[PDB]
Design a protein around this ligand. Structure first.
Ligand SMILES: Nc1nc2c(c(=O)[nH]1)[n+](CCOc1ccc(Cl)cc1)cn2[C@@H]1O[C@H](COP(=O)(O)O)[C@@H](O)[C@H]1O
Length: 187
């Protein structure tokens, strides 16, 4: 005697996600600048958020977005990131105009739609940095010594983003980033 779910239920996502924002303030500690915007666990709710926030290309330089699974904080020191690393896409000044927004939207959809299939549990999140010197986008994974997981994710990422074979992307452990400056893997 009941209604048909398809007609009126929001479409759940595999995971709940947290969207964070960062504004540089020089007088403050790094960690103090990282504020949580909101969380969502449906398709409908993702788009309400995406649709009401500024596109990455219109942020002041020194601002960032990040999307992490609920319960994983967007920093190396989190339990689920500390042994991890990221696949880094360094864009140039010209690509802010032509790729920044589409690569980030693509990255958002890779996360929420679990595009990494059997390895979607190694994915922690992603970070788009808006920077005068070059914009960066990266996907964070949980364990940098899981060769098969890491490289699979890289290969799917590169392909979902449409990057040609001649553009090489690197994977670096957060441990190295935190204490040096070195690619563990390329793709
Ligand atoms: N303790 C500590 N510090 C960090 C961390 C960290 O995870 N844990 N992250 C990495 C996380 O970034 C985020 C930025 C914006 C958001 Cl929405 C979420 C994460 C950067 N930092 C600090 O930023 C500096 C410049 O960073 P980058 O050139 O990479 O921008 C970096 O050298 C370091 O001092």
């Amino acid at each position: 005697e009941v209604a048909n779910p398809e007609h009126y239920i929001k479409h759940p996502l595999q995971n709940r996600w947290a969207l964070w924002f960062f504004k540089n303030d020089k007088s403050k500690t790094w960690q103090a600048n990282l504020r949580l915007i909101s969380k969502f666990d449906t398709v409908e709710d993702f788009w309400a958020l995406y649709n009401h926030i500024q596109l990455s290309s219109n942020l002041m330089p020194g601002c960032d977005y990040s999307l992490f699974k609920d319960g994983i904080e967007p920093m190396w020191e989190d339990e689920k990131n500390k042994r991890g690393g990221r696949w880094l896409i360094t864009l140039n000044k010209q690509q802010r105009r032509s790729d920044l927004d589409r690569f980030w939207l693509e990255t958002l959809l890779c996360l929420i739609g679990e595009s990494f299939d059997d390895y979607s549990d190694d994915v922690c999140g992603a970070v788009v940095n808006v920077r005068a010197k070059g914009d960066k986008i990266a996907i964070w994974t949980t364990e940098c010594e899981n060769r098969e997981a890491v490289t699979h994710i890289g290969r799917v990422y590169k392909e979902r983003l449409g990057l040609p074979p001649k553009i090489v992307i690197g994977y670096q452990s957060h441990a190295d980033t935190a204490t040096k400056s070195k690619n563990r893997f390329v793709v």
